[PDB]
PDB file of all heavy atoms in Angstrom:
ATOM      1  N   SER A  85      87.474 142.998 103.783  1.00  0.00           N
ATOM      2  CA  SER A  85      87.545 142.400 102.454  1.00  0.00           C
ATOM      3  C   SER A  85      88.894 141.711 102.303  1.00  0.00           C
ATOM      4  O   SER A  85      89.937 142.371 102.370  1.00  0.00           O
ATOM      5  CB  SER A  85      87.359 143.456 101.365  1.00  0.00           C
ATOM      6  OG  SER A  85      88.546 144.204 101.180  1.00  0.00           O
ATOM      7  N   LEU A  86      88.871 140.393 102.107  1.00  0.00           N
ATOM      8  CA  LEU A  86      90.090 139.601 102.060  1.00  0.00           C
ATOM      9  C   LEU A  86      90.578 139.423 100.625  1.00  0.00           C
ATOM     10  O   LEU A  86      89.818 139.523  99.658  1.00  0.00           O
ATOM     11  CB  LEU A  86      89.883 138.229 102.707  1.00  0.00           C
ATOM     12  CG  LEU A  86      89.883 138.188 104.238  1.00  0.00           C
ATOM     13  CD1 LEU A  86      89.394 136.842 104.715  1.00  0.00           C
ATOM     14  CD2 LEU A  86      91.260 138.463 104.822  1.00  0.00           C
ATOM     15  N   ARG A  87      91.871 139.128 100.511  1.00  0.00           N
ATOM     16  CA  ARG A  87      92.596 139.091  99.251  1.00  0.00           C
ATOM     17  C   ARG A  87      93.599 137.954  99.329  1.00  0.00           C
ATOM     18  O   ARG A  87      94.215 137.751 100.377  1.00  0.00           O
ATOM     19  CB  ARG A  87      93.316 140.420  98.994  1.00  0.00           C
ATOM     20  CG  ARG A  87      93.988 140.540  97.639  1.00  0.00           C
ATOM     21  CD  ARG A  87      94.758 141.849  97.539  1.00  0.00           C
ATOM     22  NE  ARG A  87      93.878 143.014  97.629  1.00  0.00           N
ATOM     23  CZ  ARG A  87      93.213 143.553  96.607  1.00  0.00           C
ATOM     24  NH1 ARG A  87      93.304 143.045  95.382  1.00  0.00           N
ATOM     25  NH2 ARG A  87      92.444 144.612  96.816  1.00  0.00           N
ATOM     26  N   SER A  88      93.780 137.243  98.207  1.00  0.00           N
ATOM     27  CA  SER A  88      94.562 136.006  98.193  1.00  0.00           C
ATOM     28  C   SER A  88      95.953 136.165  98.797  1.00  0.00           C
ATOM     29  O   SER A  88      96.476 135.222  99.401  1.00  0.00           O
ATOM     30  CB  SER A  88      94.686 135.485  96.756  1.00  0.00           C
ATOM     31  OG  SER A  88      95.359 136.418  95.929  1.00  0.00           O
ATOM     32  N   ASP A  89      96.561 137.344  98.667  1.00  0.00           N
ATOM     33  CA  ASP A  89      97.889 137.562  99.228  1.00  0.00           C
ATOM     34  C   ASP A  89      97.880 137.745 100.744  1.00  0.00           C
ATOM     35  O   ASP A  89      98.944 137.663 101.368  1.00  0.00           O
ATOM     36  CB  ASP A  89      98.556 138.758  98.515  1.00  0.00           C
ATOM     37  CG  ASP A  89      97.900 140.118  98.821  1.00  0.00           C
ATOM     38  OD1 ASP A  89      97.474 140.409  99.961  1.00  0.00           O
ATOM     39  OD2 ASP A  89      97.818 140.932  97.878  1.00  0.00           O
ATOM     40  N   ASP A  90      96.715 137.982 101.353  1.00  0.00           N
ATOM     41  CA  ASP A  90      96.638 138.181 102.796  1.00  0.00           C
ATOM     42  C   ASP A  90      96.899 136.911 103.599  1.00  0.00           C
ATOM     43  O   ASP A  90      96.936 136.986 104.833  1.00  0.00           O
ATOM     44  CB  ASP A  90      95.269 138.751 103.171  1.00  0.00           C
ATOM     45  CG  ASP A  90      95.066 140.164 102.655  1.00  0.00           C
ATOM     46  OD1 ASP A  90      96.063 140.910 102.530  1.00  0.00           O
ATOM     47  OD2 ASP A  90      93.908 140.529 102.365  1.00  0.00           O
ATOM     48  N   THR A  91      97.037 135.755 102.945  1.00  0.00           N
ATOM     49  CA  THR A  91      97.418 134.520 103.622  1.00  0.00           C
ATOM     50  C   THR A  91      98.696 134.732 104.423  1.00  0.00           C
ATOM     51  O   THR A  91      99.770 134.933 103.846  1.00  0.00           O
ATOM     52  CB  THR A  91      97.617 133.383 102.613  1.00  0.00           C
ATOM     53  OG1 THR A  91      96.407 133.169 101.877  1.00  0.00           O
ATOM     54  CG2 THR A  91      98.006 132.086 103.318  1.00  0.00           C
ATOM     55  N   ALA A  92      98.587 134.699 105.747  1.00  0.00           N
ATOM     56  CA  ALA A  92      99.734 134.911 106.620  1.00  0.00           C
ATOM     57  C   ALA A  92      99.317 134.566 108.042  1.00  0.00           C
ATOM     58  O   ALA A  92      98.152 134.267 108.315  1.00  0.00           O
ATOM     59  CB  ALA A  92     100.253 136.350 106.532  1.00  0.00           C
ATOM     60  N   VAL A  93     100.295 134.600 108.943  1.00  0.00           N
ATOM     61  CA  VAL A  93     100.087 134.361 110.366  1.00  0.00           C
ATOM     62  C   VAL A  93      99.956 135.719 111.043  1.00  0.00           C
ATOM     63  O   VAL A  93     100.847 136.567 110.918  1.00  0.00           O
ATOM     64  CB  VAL A  93     101.243 133.548 110.973  1.00  0.00           C
ATOM     65  CG1 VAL A  93     100.852 133.005 112.336  1.00  0.00           C
ATOM     66  CG2 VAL A  93     101.664 132.418 110.031  1.00  0.00           C
ATOM     67  N   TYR A  94      98.855 135.922 111.763  1.00  0.00           N
ATOM     68  CA  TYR A  94      98.517 137.197 112.389  1.00  0.00           C
ATOM     69  C   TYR A  94      98.759 137.093 113.888  1.00  0.00           C
ATOM     70  O   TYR A  94      98.192 136.213 114.545  1.00  0.00           O
ATOM     71  CB  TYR A  94      97.058 137.557 112.105  1.00  0.00           C
ATOM     72  CG  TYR A  94      96.815 137.968 110.675  1.00  0.00           C
ATOM     73  CD1 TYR A  94      96.499 137.027 109.707  1.00  0.00           C
ATOM     74  CD2 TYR A  94      96.934 139.291 110.285  1.00  0.00           C
ATOM     75  CE1 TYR A  94      96.290 137.396 108.395  1.00  0.00           C
ATOM     76  CE2 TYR A  94      96.722 139.670 108.977  1.00  0.00           C
ATOM     77  CZ  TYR A  94      96.403 138.720 108.036  1.00  0.00           C
ATOM     78  OH  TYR A  94      96.195 139.094 106.729  1.00  0.00           O
ATOM     79  N   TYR A  95      99.579 137.997 114.427  1.00  0.00           N
ATOM     80  CA  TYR A  95      99.907 138.018 115.845  1.00  0.00           C
ATOM     81  C   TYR A  95      99.344 139.262 116.523  1.00  0.00           C
ATOM     82  O   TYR A  95      99.197 140.323 115.909  1.00  0.00           O
ATOM     83  CB  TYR A  95     101.424 137.979 116.100  1.00  0.00           C
ATOM     84  CG  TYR A  95     102.151 136.743 115.608  1.00  0.00           C
ATOM     85  CD1 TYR A  95     102.218 136.426 114.255  1.00  0.00           C
ATOM     86  CD2 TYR A  95     102.755 135.881 116.508  1.00  0.00           C
ATOM     87  CE1 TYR A  95     102.882 135.299 113.819  1.00  0.00           C
ATOM     88  CE2 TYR A  95     103.411 134.755 116.085  1.00  0.00           C
ATOM     89  CZ  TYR A  95     103.475 134.465 114.739  1.00  0.00           C
ATOM     90  OH  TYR A  95     104.135 133.335 114.312  1.00  0.00           O
ATOM     91  N   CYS A  96      99.031 139.100 117.805  1.00  0.00           N
ATOM     92  CA  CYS A  96      98.731 140.193 118.719  1.00  0.00           C
ATOM     93  C   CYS A  96      99.882 140.326 119.709  1.00  0.00           C
ATOM     94  O   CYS A  96     100.354 139.323 120.258  1.00  0.00           O
ATOM     95  CB  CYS A  96      97.401 139.934 119.435  1.00  0.00           C
ATOM     96  SG  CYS A  96      97.446 138.576 120.626  1.00  0.00           S
ATOM     97  N   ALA A  97     100.363 141.555 119.895  1.00  0.00           N
ATOM     98  CA  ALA A  97     101.531 141.808 120.725  1.00  0.00           C
ATOM     99  C   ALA A  97     101.325 143.069 121.554  1.00  0.00           C
ATOM    100  O   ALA A  97     100.699 144.035 121.109  1.00  0.00           O
ATOM    101  CB  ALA A  97     102.796 141.935 119.872  1.00  0.00           C
ATOM    102  N   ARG A  98     101.877 143.047 122.765  1.00  0.00           N
ATOM    103  CA  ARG A  98     101.741 144.131 123.728  1.00  0.00           C
ATOM    104  C   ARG A  98     102.971 145.017 123.678  1.00  0.00           C
ATOM    105  O   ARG A  98     104.102 144.522 123.702  1.00  0.00           O
ATOM    106  CB  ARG A  98     101.572 143.579 125.145  1.00  0.00           C
ATOM    107  CG  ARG A  98     101.491 144.583 126.295  1.00  0.00           C
ATOM    108  CD  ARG A  98     101.192 143.830 127.598  1.00  0.00           C
ATOM    109  NE  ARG A  98     102.366 143.119 128.124  1.00  0.00           N
ATOM    110  CZ  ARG A  98     103.100 143.479 129.182  1.00  0.00           C
ATOM    111  NH1 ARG A  98     102.818 144.556 129.898  1.00  0.00           N
ATOM    112  NH2 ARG A  98     104.134 142.731 129.537  1.00  0.00           N
ATOM    113  N   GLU A  99     102.743 146.321 123.610  1.00  0.00           N
ATOM    114  CA  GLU A  99     103.808 147.305 123.726  1.00  0.00           C
ATOM    115  C   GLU A  99     104.106 147.545 125.197  1.00  0.00           C
ATOM    116  O   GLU A  99     103.246 148.036 125.937  1.00  0.00           O
ATOM    117  CB  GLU A  99     103.370 148.598 123.050  1.00  0.00           C
ATOM    118  CG  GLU A  99     104.313 149.780 123.103  1.00  0.00           C
ATOM    119  CD  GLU A  99     103.601 151.034 122.646  1.00  0.00           C
ATOM    120  OE1 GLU A  99     102.810 151.581 123.441  1.00  0.00           O
ATOM    121  OE2 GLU A  99     103.773 151.431 121.477  1.00  0.00           O
ATOM    122  N   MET A 100     105.321 147.217 125.617  1.00  0.00           N
ATOM    123  CA  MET A 100     105.736 147.574 126.959  1.00  0.00           C
ATOM    124  C   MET A 100     105.886 149.085 127.067  1.00  0.00           C
ATOM    125  O   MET A 100     106.044 149.795 126.070  1.00  0.00           O
ATOM    126  CB  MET A 100     107.055 146.889 127.317  1.00  0.00           C
ATOM    127  CG  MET A 100     108.269 147.368 126.533  1.00  0.00           C
ATOM    128  SD  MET A 100     109.726 146.336 126.830  1.00  0.00           S
ATOM    129  CE  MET A 100     110.113 146.756 128.526  1.00  0.00           C
ATOM    130  N   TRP A 101     105.822 149.573 128.300  1.00  0.00           N
ATOM    131  CA  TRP A 101     106.199 150.942 128.611  1.00  0.00           C
ATOM    132  C   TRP A 101     107.630 150.930 129.131  1.00  0.00           C
ATOM    133  O   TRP A 101     108.073 149.959 129.751  1.00  0.00           O
ATOM    134  CB  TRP A 101     105.243 151.592 129.624  1.00  0.00           C
ATOM    135  CG  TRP A 101     104.900 150.821 130.897  1.00  0.00           C
ATOM    136  CD1 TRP A 101     105.633 149.840 131.507  1.00  0.00           C
ATOM    137  CD2 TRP A 101     103.734 151.008 131.714  1.00  0.00           C
ATOM    138  NE1 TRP A 101     104.992 149.401 132.639  1.00  0.00           N
ATOM    139  CE2 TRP A 101     103.825 150.103 132.790  1.00  0.00           C
ATOM    140  CE3 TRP A 101     102.621 151.851 131.637  1.00  0.00           C
ATOM    141  CZ2 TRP A 101     102.847 150.016 133.779  1.00  0.00           C
ATOM    142  CZ3 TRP A 101     101.650 151.762 132.620  1.00  0.00           C
ATOM    143  CH2 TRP A 101     101.770 150.852 133.676  1.00  0.00           C
ATOM    144  N   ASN A 102     108.376 151.992 128.835  1.00  0.00           N
ATOM    145  CA  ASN A 102     109.774 152.013 129.248  1.00  0.00           C
ATOM    146  C   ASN A 102     110.397 153.396 129.124  1.00  0.00           C
ATOM    147  O   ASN A 102     111.442 153.544 128.481  1.00  0.00           O
ATOM    148  CB  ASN A 102     110.589 151.005 128.425  1.00  0.00           C
ATOM    149  CG  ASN A 102     111.966 150.747 129.011  1.00  0.00           C
ATOM    150  OD1 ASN A 102     112.185 150.921 130.210  1.00  0.00           O
ATOM    151  ND2 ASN A 102     112.906 150.347 128.163  1.00  0.00           N
ATOM    152  N   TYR A 103     109.758 154.404 129.731  1.00  0.00           N
ATOM    153  CA  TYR A 103     110.354 155.725 129.973  1.00  0.00           C
ATOM    154  C   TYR A 103     111.036 156.292 128.728  1.00  0.00           C
ATOM    155  O   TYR A 103     112.142 156.834 128.784  1.00  0.00           O
ATOM    156  CB  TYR A 103     111.353 155.661 131.132  1.00  0.00           C
ATOM    157  CG  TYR A 103     110.787 155.557 132.537  1.00  0.00           C
ATOM    158  CD1 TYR A 103     111.634 155.329 133.610  1.00  0.00           C
ATOM    159  CD2 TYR A 103     109.426 155.689 132.799  1.00  0.00           C
ATOM    160  CE1 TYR A 103     111.155 155.245 134.895  1.00  0.00           C
ATOM    161  CE2 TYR A 103     108.934 155.604 134.083  1.00  0.00           C
ATOM    162  CZ  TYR A 103     109.802 155.381 135.128  1.00  0.00           C
ATOM    163  OH  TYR A 103     109.306 155.292 136.409  1.00  0.00           O
ATOM    164  N   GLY A 104     110.384 156.148 127.586  1.00  0.00           N
ATOM    165  CA  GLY A 104     110.967 156.671 126.373  1.00  0.00           C
ATOM    166  C   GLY A 104     110.226 156.266 125.124  1.00  0.00           C
ATOM    167  O   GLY A 104     108.998 156.373 125.055  1.00  0.00           O
ATOM    168  N   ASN A 105     110.970 155.785 124.126  1.00  0.00           N
ATOM    169  CA  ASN A 105     110.372 155.540 122.816  1.00  0.00           C
ATOM    170  C   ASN A 105     109.317 154.453 122.900  1.00  0.00           C
ATOM    171  O   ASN A 105     108.253 154.559 122.272  1.00  0.00           O
ATOM    172  CB  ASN A 105     111.455 155.174 121.791  1.00  0.00           C
ATOM    173  CG  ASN A 105     111.062 155.556 120.353  1.00  0.00           C
ATOM    174  OD1 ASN A 105     110.635 156.676 120.123  1.00  0.00           O
ATOM    175  ND2 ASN A 105     111.257 154.650 119.388  1.00  0.00           N
ATOM    176  N   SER A 106     109.581 153.423 123.710  1.00  0.00           N
ATOM    177  CA  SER A 106     108.718 152.249 123.865  1.00  0.00           C
ATOM    178  C   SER A 106     108.457 151.730 122.453  1.00  0.00           C
ATOM    179  O   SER A 106     109.411 151.615 121.672  1.00  0.00           O
ATOM    180  CB  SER A 106     107.484 152.606 124.687  1.00  0.00           C
ATOM    181  OG  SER A 106     106.504 153.273 123.911  1.00  0.00           O
ATOM    182  N   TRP A 107     107.216 151.431 122.082  1.00  0.00           N
ATOM    183  CA  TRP A 107     106.877 151.094 120.700  1.00  0.00           C
ATOM    184  C   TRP A 107     107.621 149.848 120.218  1.00  0.00           C
ATOM    185  O   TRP A 107     107.882 149.688 119.023  1.00  0.00           O
ATOM    186  CB  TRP A 107     107.158 152.269 119.753  1.00  0.00           C
ATOM    187  CG  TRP A 107     106.303 153.510 119.938  1.00  0.00           C
ATOM    188  CD1 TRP A 107     105.371 153.741 120.909  1.00  0.00           C
ATOM    189  CD2 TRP A 107     106.295 154.672 119.095  1.00  0.00           C
ATOM    190  NE1 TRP A 107     104.794 154.975 120.729  1.00  0.00           N
ATOM    191  CE2 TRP A 107     105.344 155.568 119.623  1.00  0.00           C
ATOM    192  CE3 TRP A 107     107.005 155.043 117.948  1.00  0.00           C
ATOM    193  CZ2 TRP A 107     105.080 156.810 119.043  1.00  0.00           C
ATOM    194  CZ3 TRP A 107     106.748 156.279 117.376  1.00  0.00           C
ATOM    195  CH2 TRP A 107     105.793 157.147 117.924  1.00  0.00           C
ATOM    196  N   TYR A 108     107.987 148.973 121.151  1.00  0.00           N
ATOM    197  CA  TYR A 108     108.543 147.666 120.839  1.00  0.00           C
ATOM    198  C   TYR A 108     107.817 146.615 121.663  1.00  0.00           C
ATOM    199  O   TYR A 108     107.365 146.872 122.785  1.00  0.00           O
ATOM    200  CB  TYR A 108     110.049 147.601 121.086  1.00  0.00           C
ATOM    201  CG  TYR A 108     110.542 148.364 122.285  1.00  0.00           C
ATOM    202  CD1 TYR A 108     110.201 148.009 123.587  1.00  0.00           C
ATOM    203  CD2 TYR A 108     111.364 149.450 122.104  1.00  0.00           C
ATOM    204  CE1 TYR A 108     110.678 148.740 124.660  1.00  0.00           C
ATOM    205  CE2 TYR A 108     111.837 150.173 123.155  1.00  0.00           C
ATOM    206  CZ  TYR A 108     111.494 149.818 124.430  1.00  0.00           C
ATOM    207  OH  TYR A 108     111.972 150.556 125.481  1.00  0.00           O
TER     208      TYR A 108
END
């Protein structure tokens, strides 16, 4: 369900792995 404020640019991004927190 869409809403007028949802107008934005939507990206898909990959989380690298890196022997710890990663999540970037």
Side-chain angles (χ1 to χ4, degrees):
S85 78
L86 282 169
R87 186 184 297 275
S88 61
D89 69 39
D90 293 330
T91 301
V93 195
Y94 288 89
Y95 298 64
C96 70
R98 177 175 76 106
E99 178 192 77
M100 68 189 290
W101 49 24
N102 193 25
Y103 286 172
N105 208 49
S106 80
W107 294 5
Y108 37 66

